[PDB]
């Protein structure tokens, strides 16, 4: 994808980590898959990790979520042969000053 | 290189990323190369990333 929006684009994706080798073989067919995400200022290679973890929300495998900000006139390349939760909707944003998150349950008016 | 100058030494290097597999095989005569830099407090292993990028 090429950034032509003249604004920073927030791109989110994920890598799937099956609990056992059977799930990985039954989903991606290979047993040693690779995910690569590259950009002019972001480069990272992911390798799926097959491990058994405690059941959270009735799931043993995990999906690790990642994000990056694309400058205007920049590109991002997604290359994988398995264990990729591909992005579908990206967000174009422009930062305005500094703020924070208020943790409260008060009425809003 | 062993630092015998009694002062800290700044070392600069680089890893080349060819655009296509053809260029990787012309300059390096291989297609899966590796760079390793190891010191007593710095160690990283670099693998070339072959992708096409804006000119």
Angle at A93 between CA A89 and CA A99, to 5 degrees: 125
**Cα of B16 vs its chain's centroid, Å:** 6
C-alpha distances (whole Å) from A96 to each of A92, A93, A99, A100 are 13, 9, 9, 12
Dist CA B33 CA B15 (whole Å):
10
Contacts of A40 in chain B (CB under 8 A): 53-54
Of all residues in chain A, the one with the smallest CA distance to B52 is A77
Dist CA A64 CA A52 (whole Å):
15
Obtained via which technique?
Answer: cryo-EM
Dist CA A42 CA A66 (whole Å):
11
Dist CA B24 CA B11 (whole Å):
25
Nearest Cα residue to A35 out of A43, A44, A46, A26:
A46
Per residue, the 3-state secondary structure of A47-97, as one string, reads CCCCCCCCCECCECCEEEEEEEEECCCCEEEEEECCCCECCCCCEEECCCC
Cβ of B51 within 8 Å of Cβ of A2? The answer is no
Q: Which two tokens stand for residue A11?
A: 């791109």
Residue linked to tokens 């973890």 = A53
Q: Which two tokens stand for residue B34?
A: 């590796």
SS3 A66: strand
SS3 A22: helix
Resolution in A: 2.7
**Strands B43-46 vs A8-17: parallel, antiparallel or unpaired:** unpaired
**Residues B45 and B34 sit within 8 Å (Cβ to Cβ):** yes
Give the list of residues 6+ apart from residue A52 with CB closer than 8 angstroms, or none: A19, A20, A60
Contacts of A77 in chain B (CB under 8 A): 51-52
Mutate to test the interface with B, among A47, A71, A77 (most CBs of B within 10 A): A77
SS3 A21: helix
């Amino acid at each position: 994808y090429a950034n032509n929006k003249e604004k920073e684009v927030l791109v989110l994706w994920g890598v799937h980590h099956p609990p056992n080798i059977g799930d990985q073989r039954a989903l991606y067919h290979k047993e040693n898959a690779y995910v690569s995400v590259v950009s002019s200022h972001y480069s990272r290679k992911f390798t799926p990790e097959i491990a058994k973890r405690p059941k959270v929300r009735d799931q043993e495998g995990r999906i690790n979520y990642y994000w990056t900000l694309l400058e205007p006139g920049d590109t991002i390349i997604f290359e994988a042969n398995g264990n990729l939760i591909a992005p579908r909707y990206a967000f174009a944003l422009s930062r305005g000053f500094g703020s924070g998150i208020i943790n409260s349950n008060a009425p809003m008016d």
